[PDB]
Amino acid sequence: SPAAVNLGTAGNFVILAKSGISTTGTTHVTGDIGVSPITATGITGFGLTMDSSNTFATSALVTGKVYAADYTPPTPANMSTAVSDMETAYTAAAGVTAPAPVVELGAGNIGGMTLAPGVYKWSTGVTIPTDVTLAGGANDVWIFQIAQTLDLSNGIHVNLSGGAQAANIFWQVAGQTTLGTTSVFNGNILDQTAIVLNTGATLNGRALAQTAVTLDASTVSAS
DSSP, X not given: OOOOOOOGGGGGOSEEESSEEEEEXXXXXXXXXXXXXXXXXXXXXXXXXXXXXXXXXXXXTEESOEEETTSSTTHHHHHHHHHHHHHHHHHHHHHOOSSOOEESGGGGBOTTOEEOSEEEEESSOEEESSOEEEEOOTTOXXXXXXXXXXXXXXXXXXXXXXXXXXXGEEEEESSOEEEOTTOEEEEEEEESSOEEEOTTOEEEEEEEESSXXXXXXXXXXXX
16 A cells, blocks of 8 residues: 555645635535635635634535635634645655556546556546446555546546545546536545536545635535
């Protein structure tokens, strides 16, 4: 098994973004969310209410807390550190060289495959047009290194089997990750750009984007 990627304090968020978090429709998030260095005007659709400390906000849509760069200390500093830790984790995940990888598997199409724990690397994008299964134990790790986009097709699932846990799966994606309508994704998405959830998509994991995260009637949870 690979060693788990260190998310640092970005591991305290189920959605972390640099340029925005937007929602429409019947969304349900469990966990904390935040943006930095942008202000909370970049968090749209959530009907935010500040705590009296102004260190966080709450939303009916979020079982947890909402943070932004323009909140009261120590939130700005904490958010800058979470974003730095995300950027550090992205670069580390992209840089893992042991165990030695499986490279260009399926020419990027992992549909129908069962993948053991390991490091998987592509020069292409990755597409999941039929279910993929990640099969392994409670503490087994997967690290996916994707030089282009990641796409989960409508209605498709990233299945976990054998004790595999979403928390121990890491998707490093240089292009956009797009989760199709009514899809179900497992793992942490370290995106250089955007993470997009189309209508009804479910993410079990974390959406850690260096641009934006968009939700459409989506469920996001790390628990």
